[PDB]
Amino acid sequence: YTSLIHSLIEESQNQQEKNEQELLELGEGEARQELSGIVQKQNNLLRQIEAQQHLLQLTVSKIKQLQARILAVERYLKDQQDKLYREVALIRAQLQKIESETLQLLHQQAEIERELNNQEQEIGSLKQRGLIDGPLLSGIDQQQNNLKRAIEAQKHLLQLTVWGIKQLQARILAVERYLKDQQL
């Protein structure tokens, strides 16, 4: 669900906005500087979630498009060279590109979950402290729930992308073995 994730990202942007406005209306002596740190950290993390969603959707398009190329080759062989071996090699080339683009996804995912965990600990401590403004800390707590949910969906998306890549590798490998059998 691109749409559902984008509704959550959109909602996360409004919460970030509301949080920041609630922050600037505090007096200079309400730990307003301290709270400002975590609010900005939530903004940086939202940016990385946004960036991750863009690359995920691109990678997912390339996989779906490569799956259609492999299918076309499988049907071409059913309805039956040289131009065939160039197609197979080019499919392997595209696949290799997707593999390293998915390597950036895993890098960013790890850093994103690293930042989310350190924020959970910070906000965990803030929640025990009573003197901290109730409304703003509620919006900070709500935003953390938003970012965590987004990260959770993107994690499952990334795992399916790693999964489909291995499926394409096996499927293009089967096409290679069928072709070397015919050459015999």
Q: State the method.
A: X-ray
Which CATH number do you get for residue 47? 1.20.58
**Which range marks the domain in which residue 44 is found?**
2-183
In terms of Cα–Cα distance, which of 156, 40, 7, 171 is closest to 95?
171
Quoted resolution (Å): 2.3
CA-wise closest residue to 112 among 22, 28, 47, 31? 47
DSSP letter for each residue of 27-87: -TTSSHHHHHHHHHHHHHHHHHHHHHHHHHHHHHHHHHHHHHHHHHHHHHHH----HHHHH
Sign of the four-CA dihedral 139, 141, 144, 148? negative
Q: In angstroms, rounded to a whole number, what is the distance separating the alpha carbons of residues 170 and 184?
A: 21
Distance CA 36, CA 16 (A): 12
Nearest one of 170, 182, 176 to 85, comparing CA atoms: 176
Would you give the DSSP letter of residue 139?
H
Distance CA 64, CA 168 (A): 10
**Could you tell me if 41 and 115 are in contact, meaning their C-beta atoms sit under 8 angstroms apart?**
yes
Look up residue 44 and give its two tokens: 């940086």
Q: For the chain, how many structural domains are there in total?
A: 1
- CB neighbour list of residue 104: distance below 8 Å, 6 or more residues apart: 55
**Using CB atoms within 10 A of its CB, is residue 148 exposed (0-12), middle (13-18) or buried (19+)?**
middle
